């Protein structure tokens, strides 16, 4: 049974330095199995630097939960958004490379990211 922390790595982590990326990664990381996710962000940093965010700036998630954290620094990311004619099971993404703060919700001890909220 995949843990939430491991799913976060599968959905959100690609430490390698980076217009088709999103289309290719959403398919290949097996993220479009059940429905098209409307947005999904990949983070191009070490896993450690991402897990570190859980001890950086405590913020509210968009939904109002308060166990979210914003990276003190911006991070290299790819933002993937549904575009054009995307329709399950044929999902379609627009790719945008950026440098933005990430906001994650953290759970557990060890306290690690379990949900990617937004990039700002």
């Amino acid at each position, epitope marked *: 049974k995949e843990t939430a922390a491991a799913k976060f790595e599968r959905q959100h982590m690609d430490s390698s330095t980076s217009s088709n990326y999103c289309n290719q990664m959403m398919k290949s990381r097996n993220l479009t199995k059940d429905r098209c996710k409307p947005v999904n962000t990949f983070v191009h940093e070490s896993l450690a630097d991402v897990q570190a965010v859980c001890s950086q700036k405590n913020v509210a998630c968009k939904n109002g939960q308060t166990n979210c954290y914003q990276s003190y620094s911006t991070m290299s990311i790819t933002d993937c958004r549904e575009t054009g004619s995307s329709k399950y099971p044929n999902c379609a993404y627009k790719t945008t490379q950026a440098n933005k703060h990430i906001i994650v*919700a953290c759970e557990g001890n060890p306290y690690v990211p379990v949900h990617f909220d937004a990039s700002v």
Partner: nanobody
Amino acid sequence: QVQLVESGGGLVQAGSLRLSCAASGYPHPYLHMGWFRQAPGKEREGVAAMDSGGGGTLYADSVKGRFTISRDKGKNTVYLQMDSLKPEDTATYYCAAGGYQLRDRTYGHWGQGTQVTVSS
């Protein structure tokens, strides 16, 4: 410094104690801070938590009317005033910060634990 440090606690009778906890070196507000306990024989449970900006205060049903939580304004310090104490309040108490409401798994930043043993 950055880590939470608890004080107070120990032996008490059916009766009063005041626990305190500070993370003075964490240099932003922790949105939620609160207290959890693990009573002998029982899963850890949240006892009280309070938001930094008016977003809410919460008590476990079993302590309503007996315990009162408070926080310093804009310093990461949280207090638990414990009155009307019962033997079943015996427990290791823990300060927590940076999580949401009374959800143990959402808190990853903890004090060191404080034993409270309530006698007849």
